[model samples]
Target: GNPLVYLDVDANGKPLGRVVLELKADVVPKTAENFRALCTGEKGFGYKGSTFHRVIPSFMCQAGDFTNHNGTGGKSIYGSRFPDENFTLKHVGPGVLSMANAGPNTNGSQFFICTIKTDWLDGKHVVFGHVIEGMDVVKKIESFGSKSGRTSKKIVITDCGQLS
Candidate 1:
């Protein structure tokens, strides 16, 4: 079975709910491990107080930049950045979790959840997981963002960790 993780979300200080994700560890072990480690904070850094910096509705919600919190800075547990594990996974449809990068082989702590089917992203981004639950929370997050990938209210990941 794949590994499961949870993100307790809040929008402008109001608790929304938990967003559960199922990592494709079987297919992308390295990429999945990076997310899992970040969730558990086993590396002393994780997605605890991170904000969903970018949220473009009908597209996806982006987050995981615990550093800058705006989409500029973040580092991987492996190092500053890591190469794309592979393009084996596809951006098949909604709730798809994949790394966000400058171009190629530049994936760091930044990630995104697709709210719609994005075939244009296929083979360009590494798909490692999907939101198994709490997509309502994801949609709530989506509601806060505009077409420019900027959010009105800061949708924050108030807390996060692995689910046994």
Candidate 2:
């Protein structure tokens, strides 16, 4: 993101925690910008009341399918699909944030935060942002996570906007 962005997540309507992040704008400008716009409703669309559709403890937690609650929905603020930005970083380690796309050059509005390194996703996803705080809350969510692509809990971003 061009400026620092904050996303406060709530689980099942209860306050889970905050995800303070800075997108890799320098390297992945397009991808990061898309994420920032989606997170803050910059384009009359956002991920304010979405759900965590897919979660795998040893892998990552996926969400941002704002329109569908399931993993099969979402679009870009640009009103059309966008190509993947250049990749220059590895998974490196845990707490990594990445985009969730359908296929090549089809990045829209899905993303995931890695609870584990998940090196395998390095080439498949765009590593945009990294969590700046509250990883414990992520673990808590993952602890009771599932892979059924269900929206049992409500993940609402209480307040998220750009902060330079």
Candidate 3:
């Protein structure tokens, strides 16, 4: 069994609150172990205070890098990348959780939850979980952007613990 991480955003910019992420063990068992490690305090410190510095509306909300607060910072200390555990789950709608990567078999710690249906990511990213609540927070995130490019924001995972 896995747990959920409730994300509380400091979105003073808009009307938003907490977003909850519930890990799905049955869908992606291989990735769930690492997720559980992070939730159970064994690997929890790596995510705490980390920033979700990348947010592209109608695309995704990304985080989970301990070194630079961007997606490129985190590394797999397990010394290797896990093989792609492709599952039937699709990136069909908002709040769908999926692993982030540069290419095939390149996923480390970075992951994202979609705010809309992204069929383009179906066969590539690993779908492991979904947001059980608070998608309004995600909408607020996408609203901030400039003509040059969307500015990155900080999403601090203030609390993470077991749910039942």
Candidate 4:
């Protein structure tokens, strides 16, 4: 079965809603597994309390840096970082989930959801999942973003976990 995950978001101290994703484990097993583990918090550190640090309208909203709460820090389940899994998945449209990296093969705990067909990201970032539910919620988060790629108000992942 495809692994499902969720993130309960809060903006400006209010609960927005949950964003559920369907991980494409069949195409990117290792990347999917790492994301699933982070959602579960089985390792005792996960997305809870993380903030969407970087966001840009018509681009993507980014988060999952549980360590620094900024784009600078986070570690993968395997280690500090991992190699790029594959480019089989394409960033064809909105809600496409992909790993956020500093450069090639530098994936860690950072991730993002596309707000549009960001074809420029294809093959550069590992596409591991997509939003199955809560596109509205994702949009709400997107609304808080600016052209500066930073939120005017904090958009936080209040909670997250694996559904299956």
Candidate 5:
């Protein structure tokens, strides 16, 4: 899903956010499909009010939860799981998109975008795409953190669709 889609998120007619994210069709096919199934229509309902609920400065920002409205909740509706693709991609720098997982095969709908080179995640997470633009937006979103050191900013992906 390279060059996948661009979503302009707004609040009261003013642009509040922007995210250039793509689905990982090549790396984790089934997982990607499950994400699409959950996000393409009313079925993609879980992501509606979710936010980029977690962030680490000079590290990564994560979102995509339907239940807790935070990064700690949300489950895959497909009930599907796969071994980590563990591709050769590296979390080298900003805007690197990678899957969020509990272990090797526990990835579902959660993902994160790196804001700096996180060598610690080199061989751990599955890197899927890179945010070509909006590195500043990524930084802005990460600034809002909760008392638990978790971010509580509500970043709705207003509307997401495909390119022609």
Candidate 6:
């Protein structure tokens, strides 16, 4: 199915623009459900105010720590990791959305959107979506993070809702 996600930038410093994602619920059904539910604000646990707490250059940008806003507190929609949706999708290039975790089977509410190619993360993280619009905004956030390699700034999610 085609599940969409809308992001309003600064709408942290702000999208300077916006980031639109066309979530691929076809390949990674369960994982996609987790993310989709979050985007839709299911059960009052949406991604509305989540910030990109961890940013890495030549790597990827991490966020979805909605529960704590500190990159350390987040869990699955079902309250715990379901399983590894590994290989369902690969982190081929920029604007790919992937699940973040501590180790194996730890896919949770935390996720990342890469502004650069990170094939090394192919087998490790689950790539569930890709930017269909406004990747420039993603690159902006990436560049913002890369400029100082600091988590001091934020790319906040002003709104998140499904469009399918």
| C-alpha lDDT values of all predictions | 0.92, 0.78, 0.69, 0.93, 0.65, 0.78
Ten-residue stretch with the least lDDT total in model 1: 155-164
Error of 5 at 92 (Å): 1.4
Using Cα atoms with residue i matched to residue i, what is each candidate's TM-score against the true structure?
0.98, 0.90, 0.83, 0.98, 0.77, 0.90
Comparing 4 and 6 on TM-score, the stronger one: 4
Q: Going through the candidates in order, what is the number of backbone clashes in each?
A: 0, 1, 0, 0, 3, 4
RMSD of 6: 1.9
Cα lDDT tens digits for candidate 6, 1-164: 57887776652454466788888877877888888888888777878878877787767778888888876788787876677875767778888988888877888899888877888887887788888898777767776675544754667877778767
Q: Write the per-residue lDDT of candidate 5 for residues 1-164, one digit (tens) a residue.
A: 34364455543344566666666677766555555555554464555555666767667777776677666667676554456765667888888888788877777678788878887887777787777656666777666544454655445666654441
List where candidate 4 sits over 4 angstroms from the true fold: none
Model 2 TM-score? 0.90
Q: Which stretches of candidate 5 lie over 4 Å from their true place?
A: 1-3, 10-14, 31-39, 42-46, 146-148
lDDT (Cα, tens digit) per residue for candidate 1, span 1-164: 89999999998899999999999999999999999999999999989998999889899999999988879988999899999899998888889999999998998999999999988998889999999999998999899989999889978888888896
Model 4 lDDT per residue over 5-114, tens place: 99999999999999999999999999999999999899988888889999999899999898888789999999999999899999999999999999999999999999
Candidate that would win on lDDT? 4
Q: Which prediction has more favorable TM-score, 3 or 6?
A: 6
Off by over 4 Å in 6: 11-15, 147-149
lDDT of 3 by residue, 1-164 (tens): 55676665664333257777788787777776566565444653556556666777657777777677756667553533566787578888988989888889876777787878998888998898888888777677666533332445445665555564
lDDT (Cα, 0-100) at 65 in candidate 5: 69
